[PDB]
Automatic annotation (TrEMBL), chains A, B:
Gene Ontology molecular function: hexosyltransferase activity
Residue ranges the record marks as coiled coil: none
Name of the protein described by the UniProt record: Glycosyltransferase protein
Organism: Bacteroides fragilis (strain ATCC 25285 / DSM 2151 / CCUG 4856 / JCM 11019 / LMG 10263 / NCTC 9343 / Onslow / VPI 2553 / EN-2)
Residues of the signal peptide: none
Lineage, broadest ranks: Bacteria, Pseudomonadati, Bacteroidota, Bacteroidia, Bacteroidales
Stretch of the intact protein here: 2 to 216 of 342
Domain of life (superkingdom): Bacteria
Amino acid sequence: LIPKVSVIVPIYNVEKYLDQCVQALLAQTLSDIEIILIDDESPDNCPKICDDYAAQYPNIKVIHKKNAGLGMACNSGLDVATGEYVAFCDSDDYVDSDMYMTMYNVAQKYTCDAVFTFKLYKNKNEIHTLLKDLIASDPYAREERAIQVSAKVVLYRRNLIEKKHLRFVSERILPSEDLIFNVDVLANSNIVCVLP
Amino acid sequence: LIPKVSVIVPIYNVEKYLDQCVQALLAQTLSDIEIILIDDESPDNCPKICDDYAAQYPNIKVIHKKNAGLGMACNSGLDVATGEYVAFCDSDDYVDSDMYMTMYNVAQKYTCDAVFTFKLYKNKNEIHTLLKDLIASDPYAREERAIQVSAKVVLYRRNLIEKKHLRFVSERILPSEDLIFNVDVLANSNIVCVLP
């Protein structure tokens, strides 16, 4: 009925990586995956490659936009996403087929609001403490947290994002847009897990 | 004898803008400026442009490096800077003739550890209050604070950076590298001011 995970892929001049990427998402072990391709006015052949996929498969949604950046692209993806969970995958990244299964199962077991990249944070208080490292004096602890919090592979409970109206800030305004979005999620969550 | 301000210029494929950039730096009203050109193994003719400038002016230092990125390039500049204050200048920016004078004076008057982008944060406690918005619930306050903290032009009290050996993380490892470095500085400062 409702997709288990919506995977949004922001696309811009990656025609040499796209196929392997979408094909890795199509090979996932987890069922009911909704794949969303956002063509941010890609100069190469990605626009047709997206149509080809949307035509050859039933779980692939596509949107062709006038160029506006990856952050805004991910947002368009979120607007059409319908899965219980949502995630972002870079064009130049072909993921391991057991990946989403692993993250989904974990998130379902502990009712997570987000699963990063073993530690479980049961309340916003424990999460808050995790975030304090970003603004305390110690550089290394801040570097460590920023790195962790900026992990590329993250699974978010979609309704937390919608309820909180969380969206990416354009990278053209904030180059650290991905980190900020992740903090938006963490500072507004209750339960969070971090995988090895 | 020691320079007032050290301007670090990370260089890569900017042959067409380098002259105007260095010249804008030479035309500054401030008297003791140390210009540090970090040739990040540029493919064009920037390496020779760099040698020609160091050979013509004694206050211009050049470092020919193996490619490693902008963050690492800034670190290389910090490794050799000697000015009382330091700043980073994008190769494609042609700066106003009195920009550094103005920030130097401002810095000297309130004994700032950093001058951004009128506000004056007198102590750690005030600066910390500022950093709190980056991790609190409200997405808007975090966005705005992150935007100002990510101001492109900032004058840093060099001794602060050296005493805490603050350094940039590679953009290749952490995209938010610029924001993180300014947070390192802020979280370790007494007195910080923002220019309107």
